[PDB]
Amino acid sequence: QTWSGPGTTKRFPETVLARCVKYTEIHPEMRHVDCQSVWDAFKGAFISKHPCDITEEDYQPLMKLGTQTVPCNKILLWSRIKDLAHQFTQVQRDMFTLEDTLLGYLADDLTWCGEFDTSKINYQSCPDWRKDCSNNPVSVFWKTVSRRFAEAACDVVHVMLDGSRSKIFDKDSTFGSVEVHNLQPEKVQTLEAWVIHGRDLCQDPTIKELESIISKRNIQFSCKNIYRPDKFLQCVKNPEDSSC
Numbered sequence: 001q002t003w004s005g006p007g008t009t010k011r012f013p014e015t016v017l018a019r020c021v022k023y024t025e026i027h028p029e030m031r032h033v034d035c036q037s038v039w040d041a042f043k044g045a046f047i048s049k050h051p052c053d054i055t056e057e058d059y060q061p062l063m064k065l066g067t068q069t070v071p072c073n074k075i076l077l078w079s080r081i082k083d084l085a086h087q088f089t090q091v092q093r094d095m096f097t098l099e100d101t102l103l104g105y106l107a108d109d110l111t112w113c114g115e116f117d118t119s120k121i122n123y124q125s126c127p128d129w130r131k132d133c134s135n136n137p138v139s140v141f142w143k144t145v146s147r148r149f150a151e152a153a154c155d156v157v158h159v160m161l162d163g164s165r166s167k168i169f170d171k172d173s174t175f176g177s178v179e180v181h182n183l184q185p186e187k188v189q190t191l192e193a194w195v196i197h198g199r200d201l202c203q204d205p206t207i208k209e210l211e212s213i214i215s216k217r218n219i220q221f222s223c224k225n226i227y228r229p230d231k232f233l234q235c236v237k238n239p240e241d242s243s244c
């Protein structure tokens with residue numbers, strides 16, 4: 001095998017297309033997206049390209065077709081706690097993660113790459129970010145869309161963090177390396193962290209580091225513990241409870 005990472009997800013083309021159809025069927029704003037054109041732009045970003053030479057520019061046509069206004073004050077970022085974040089926005093349809101946007105939805109949990117100077121999709125292997133190269137089709141996609149998603153944020157932006165991790169805030173994560181640095185100080189008043197337990201984890205040294213970084217960008221920092229994730233989701237679903 002050429003690469004260290006898993007290959008393209010089985011029936012990736014069909015999957016992307018069907019996810020686009022489903023998304024544009026559900027969301028009114030996207031009711032006039034051409035899903036064939038979306039797929040054309042998507043594969044055009046990586047097909048026939050060396051999968052270690054992908055650029056942010058390669059994804060521009062896809063970004064254009066997938067342009068979407070998201071309510072800027074309703075953004076939930078997350079790091080290393082994907083499941084709860086998505087369960088949260090499933091209940092509180094008010095709030096959006098990146099994976100609730102058209103492009104994030106299309107790509108979530110999928111792997112893809114092409115081969116240099118041929119039209120084939122590589123279903124055998126693809127570059128691993130760490131072992132092979134960082135400018136691969138998947139990593140460059142997420143870097144670009146997550147930057148744009150962070151730039152769209154305003155007002156109070158929330159981030160869900162995993163408090164069972166050794167690094168609750170990890171500066172090397174997508175959240176720490178891309179999103180925190182692309183929030184716009186002109187628009188974003190506060191970054192509020194929700195530290196999810198499995199103790200005042202808002203006093204953890206990495207949260208303090210996050211606090212310092214954000215403050216120095218002239219954005220306010222707030223932090224809250226979520227001691228009981230189950231009860232959290234319970235109250236998100238049934239919030240009028242006295243118990244909430």
Ligand SMILES: Nc1nc2c(=O)[nH]cnc2n1CCCCOP(=O)(O)OP(=O)(O)OC[C@H]1O[C@H](O)[C@H](O)[C@@H]1O
Binds near residue numbers: 145146173174
């Ligand atoms: N969002 C996302 N989905 C996938 C996927 O399905 N496959 C490969 N990558 C994926 N990404 C980007 C990488 C997220 C995985 O966690 P990571 O590399 O340690 O960096 P994290 O802080 O955990 O990233 C999650 C944050 O960035 C994303 O924009 C998301 O909106 C969240 O705010």
